[PDB]
Amino acid sequence: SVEFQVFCFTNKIRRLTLHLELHKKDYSSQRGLRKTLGKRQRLLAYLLKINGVRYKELISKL
Amino acid sequence: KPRLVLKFIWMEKNIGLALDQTIPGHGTVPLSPYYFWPRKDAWEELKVLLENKPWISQKQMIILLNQATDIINLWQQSGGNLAS
């Protein structure tokens, strides 16, 4: 299941970001946010590598 | 849990205290450790060995320590005097 990985990582970045911006100095979870961004980004380049229209739907969903 | 023997020896210069210890619910073999002629601590060495065991109950550790203490005590008095 791929779109649950992208969507799940998106909610991960939402909850972790609204953690981090009202907190502002945790330099440990910064790596977690950046590993999630990079991991999701290699997924988006993967599904963009496979398809057009379907990845256009992944952009249009979020 | 078997039960226990300190053996002391007094010769004028030198104490030895020798702690022979015994088994808990876990089958173990102690020696008798003999603590030695130089001024290096006998009670601390003995008691610490017992505490390191936990295999020794408090009553057991204490009774042997009391006997050990008594001999070190007699030894100190004889060394300060000449008893022999």
Partner: protein, 64 residues
């Protein structure tokens, strides 16, 4: 030994105080002969009971 099934809490002052000395200080794993897990868990529990003044931080020296 003496795990006794129920977990070690600050409320269990039976197996705790078998682990401190009468001088009131924590004994190591090789003396108490437990696992690492038992040792750390009684460590945190003993220091909790140290906060609640159930246990002294120092016991006054005595002779005779």
């Amino acid at each position: 030994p003496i795990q006794s099934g129920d977990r070690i809490d600050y409320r269990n002052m039976s197996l705790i105080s078998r682990f401190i000395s009468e001088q009131g200080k924590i004994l190591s794993r090789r003396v108490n002969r437990l696992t690492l897990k038992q040792q750390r868990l009684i460590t945190s529990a003993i220091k909790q009971a140290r906060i609640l003044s159930l246990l002294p931080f120092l016991n006054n020296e005595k002779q005779f």
